[PDB]
Amino acid sequence: MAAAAVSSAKRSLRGELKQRLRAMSAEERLRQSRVLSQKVIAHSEYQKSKRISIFLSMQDEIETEEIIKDIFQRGKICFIPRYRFQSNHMDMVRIESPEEISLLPKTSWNIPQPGEGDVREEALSTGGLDLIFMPGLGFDKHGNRLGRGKGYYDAYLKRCLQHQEVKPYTLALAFKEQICLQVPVNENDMKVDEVLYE
């Protein structure tokens, strides 16, 4: 019953967060995205990181395009999510340029990811990750994260705590609108090291 009461709060907050996000102008999204991009490029953990995981942005997410360009300009090794829609399973798969993203097939969420027969280098098979940019519907200032309900990123973060002597740095990119007072969590949810916004 306590488990269910947590899920209910998470579900209620998602709907509340999604309404706010849907109500944002396209040009305001692009604006905070530009503010976060510049903040990320200045960020010391980003500048030091050599192997990176970043997400490809949905319409209700901070746009990562300018970050991805910077990543490749600085010769960083770039990995992106490849979701296995059957379960809460994802890997991080290597892409070799920003332009490759444009030719990839898309999922039912209209997000690019290498297809089923496209054999990719997975981050955890070649040394893990220094830095993971974390998407999500909401974050609080304690680093608690509210995902979309599937727990892909919670599960993946636990996997990185195998393989890696030193865990990845986890950097969430959030609209000011996604910043919450209290994000409902259970013992299974994974905090992020830092939430960027403004």
**Residues annotated within a binding site for substrate:** 56, 61, 148-152
- By beta-carbon proximity to Mg ion, the closer residue of 70 and 154 is 154
Structure tokens given for 40: 């990320």
d(CA 65, CA 101) in angstroms, rounded, equals 10
* Residue with smallest beta-carbon separation from Ni ion: 91
How big is the chain, counted in residues? Answer: 198
Identify the DSSP state of 126. T
User: Residue 143 phi/psi, 5° resolution?
Assistant: 85, 5
Residues engaged in binding Mg ion (CB under 5 A): 29, 48-49, 63, 84-85, 89, 91-92, 96, 106, 122-124, 130, 143-145, 147, 154-156, 159, 180-181, 185, 189, 191, 198
Given phi > 0 = left and psi -120 to 50 = alpha, else beta, which region is 182? beta
State the binding partner of 54 from Ni ion, Mg ion, none, CB within 5 to 8 A by kind: none
The answer to whether 91 contacts Ni ion (rule: CB under 5 A) is: yes
Least Cβ distance, residue 1 to Mg ion (angstroms):
20
List of residues contacting Ni ion (CB under 5 A):
91
